[PDB]
């Protein structure tokens, strides 16, 4: 007996058919459009969307005044609104089946850094986040897949110890300034 937890999950599912041109082109489109690293991140977002859609469908099979349906449907809709995927006016279960992978890919921190103008491209955004240049409300974030909430959207600022921010220059600029 040990005081350790053995609970864990896989966050993705490998596709059942490995080679088909349509899915390969769609996944390549998504990777290039959002600056992703591998097919595994696309599959991870696919898996979250599939889980959400399955929960929404199983709730939709329930009677309209089921207490579980009301409670858990309101919870799921509230979460999907909170992370910025659904609008506050589309809070109905049926609309959940209308969601795409691209919404969840927009709510990532890499996309929000590119769209807010902090980075000149999506790959520049990924590099900026990974190099401890990006903070959320006070908190330096190193994770490009950090899903930004709506209330954290206006507080992405640029890391008070960063060279382009608070002002201590990096290794390269300090080394060059000492040559002459």
């Amino acid at each position: 007996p040990v005081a350790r937890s053995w609970v864990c999950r896989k966050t993705y599912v490998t596709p059942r058919r490995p080679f088909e041109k349509s899915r390969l082109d769609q996944e390549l489109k998504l990777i290039g459009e959002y600056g992703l690293r591998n097919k595994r991140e696309v599959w991870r977002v696919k898996f979250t969307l599939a889980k959400i859609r399955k929960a929404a469908r199983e709730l939709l099979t329930l009677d309209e005044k089921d207490p579980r349906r009301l409670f858990e449907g309101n919870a799921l809709l509230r979460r999907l609104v909170r992370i910025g995927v659904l609008d506050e006016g589309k809070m109905k279960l049926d609309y959940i089946l209308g969601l795409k992978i691209e919404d969840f890919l927009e709510r990532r921190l890499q996309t929000q850094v590119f769209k807010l103008g902090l980075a000149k491209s999506i790959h520049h955004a990924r590099v900026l986040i990974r190099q401890r240049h990006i903070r959320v409300r006070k908190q330096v974030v190193n994770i490009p897949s950090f899903i930004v909430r709506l209330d954290s959207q206006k507080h992405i600022d640029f890391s008070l110890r960063s060279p382009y921010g608070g002002g201590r220059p990096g290794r390269v600029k300090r080394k060059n300034a000492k040559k002459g």
Partner: peptide, 20 residues
């Protein structure tokens, strides 16, 4: 010379496939 790896190779693939 060396091949790019990681995100950079997929970016080069996406440029080679969809841009032109």
């Amino acid at each position: 010379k060396k091949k790019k790896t990681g995100r950079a190779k997929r970016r080069m693939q996406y440029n080679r496939r969809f841009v032109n």
